[PDB]
From Swiss-Prot:
Glycosylation-annotated residues: 150
Annotated protein name in UniProt: Orexin/Hypocretin receptor type 1
GO cellular component assignments: plasma membrane; synapse
Further comment found in the protein's record: The antagonists suvorexant and SB-674042 bind at the cognate neuropeptide binding site that is situated between the transmembrane helices and accessible from the extracellular side of the membrane.
UniProt gene name: HCRTR1
Organism (species): Homo sapiens
Ranges per topology, Cytoplasmic: 24-38, 97-116
Annotated GO biological process: cellular response to hormone stimulus; chemical synaptic transmission; feeding behavior; neuropeptide signaling pathway; positive regulation of ERK1 and ERK2 cascade; regulation of cytosolic calcium ion concentration
Amino acid sequence: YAWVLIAAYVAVFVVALVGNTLVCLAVWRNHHMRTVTNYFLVNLSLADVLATAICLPASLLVDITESWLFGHALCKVIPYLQAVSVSVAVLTLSFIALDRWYAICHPLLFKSTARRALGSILGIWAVSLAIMVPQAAVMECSSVLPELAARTRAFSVCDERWADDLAPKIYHSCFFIVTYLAPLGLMAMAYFQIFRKLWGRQIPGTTSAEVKQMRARRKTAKMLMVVVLVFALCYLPISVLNVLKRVFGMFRQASDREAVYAAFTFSHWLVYANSAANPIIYNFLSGKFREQFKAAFSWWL
Ligand SMILES: CCCCCCCC/C=C\CCCCCCCC(=O)O[C@H](COC(=O)CCCCCCCCCCCCCCC)COP(=O)(O)OC[C@@H](O)CO
Ligand SMILES: Cc1nc2ccc(NC(=O)Nc3ccnc4cccnc34)cc2o1
Ligand SMILES: Cc1nc2ccc(NC(=O)Nc3ccnc4cccnc34)cc2o1
Ligand SMILES: CCCCCCCCS[C@@H]1O[C@H](CO)[C@@H](O)[C@H](O)[C@H]1O
Ligand SMILES: CCCCCCCCS[C@@H]1O[C@H](CO)[C@@H](O)[C@H](O)[C@H]1O
Ligand SMILES: CCCCCCCCS[C@@H]1O[C@H](CO)[C@@H](O)[C@H](O)[C@H]1O
Ligand SMILES: CCCCCCCCS[C@@H]1O[C@H](CO)[C@@H](O)[C@H](O)[C@H]1O
């Protein structure tokens, strides 16, 4: 079990870094690949690399050693950067769907540009950095017997420190709704309307150019729906496990301590596995990204 963890964590580390760097290079090299959607997808890669590079290594040591060995300052920074990486992801996926929904379903209300996209991308970070500040405030590094901290860090853990039972129940309920259920719920309805408008609307006088627009828009909607679907599945375990632990007070009886720790461990890895999955999704569901990933691999061999 222990080596399978390190092997899986190492594979996700390499694939996510190599893949997400190629995702930025592909949009940079190809000019008429700099679409609003693909600019948001690059911002999604910038979040994934921040999680993979910085938070993932702390991820492996905590799940194996079961203790925090990086000191008090990083106990707030790293969990904060992990939380910010999640907010940036879900907000980027939300703006993508909002962009596609006004494009496919309500075509002439708002106009999306590359100039407005970079402004949204800077807004996604301004919000993600702000709303995760309370999370960093709650992070505290403390050892079993705190007098032990003067001797070693092998027995200290970095966890949330709440002053009352009610506060975590409200906090983690709001952040499950706000950052998982609500966005995915609104997005599932948006892509369903996008699905109906792309597959089914057969108005009699559609020009040959209107169809060449649809046949390409279908290929992007197919790719983006697979991305949202994998994101929902990847973050489902950690999100439900966090709510059952914090809000519902579960997983406190040490009779099933082994199964609970193996569950949360796999849930932590699944979060990073999503960072490696997305570039793979682009390779198979996007011929333009596939074409760019082809060239980057020829230069190397
Ligand atoms: C989040 C952070 C803050 C926001 C930040 C911004 C991010 C926002 C992201 C995406 C926005 C996308 C908007 C997409 C809207 C699409 C929703 C939509 O139209 O759904 C229709 C109605 O559903 C229906 O009947 C049923 C209505 C839905 C009620 C059931 C919901 C169950 C709970 C599930 C979770 C809900 C969470 C909601 C938000 C908190 C589908 O039917 P139908 O084609 O006939 O419509 C015809 C009708 O449009 C005209 O008569
Ligand atoms: C090493 C390591 N330790 C970790 C501890 C936690 C997490 N992730 C979460 O707790 N995610 C989430 C919590 C709560 N609501 C969410 C809503 C949407 C998405 N995600 C979450 C990753 C970790 O990686
Ligand atoms: C919406 C939302 N709410 C959230 C609450 C928490 C977190 N993430 C953590 O708490 N991460 C971590 C905590 C503790 N040790 C770690 C070690 C390595 C990496 N990460 C962590 C993400 C969230 O996203
Ligand atoms: C019985 C309770 C536990 C007692 C542990 C005593 C051995 C600590 S060895 C080691 O000492 C280094 C400094 O010399 C520190 O940098 C490490 O963090 C620490 O691990
Ligand atoms: C020093 C930074 C905090 C680290 C330790 C956190 C312990 C509880 S903090 C937080 O304080 C609020 C008032 O500010 C209260 O309303 C909350 O119930 C309480 O949970
Ligand atoms: C969106 C907000 C969701 C809030 C969900 C949790 C509601 C409170 S449960 C309640 O908590 C109290 C404080 O711990 C205890 O005194 C009780 O015994 C227990 O029944
Ligand atoms: C056989 C009966 C078992 C009863 C106990 C089940 C666990 C209840 S915990 C309580 O549940 C609320 C919802 O009811 C949540 O909103 C609160 O956050 C949480 O604190």
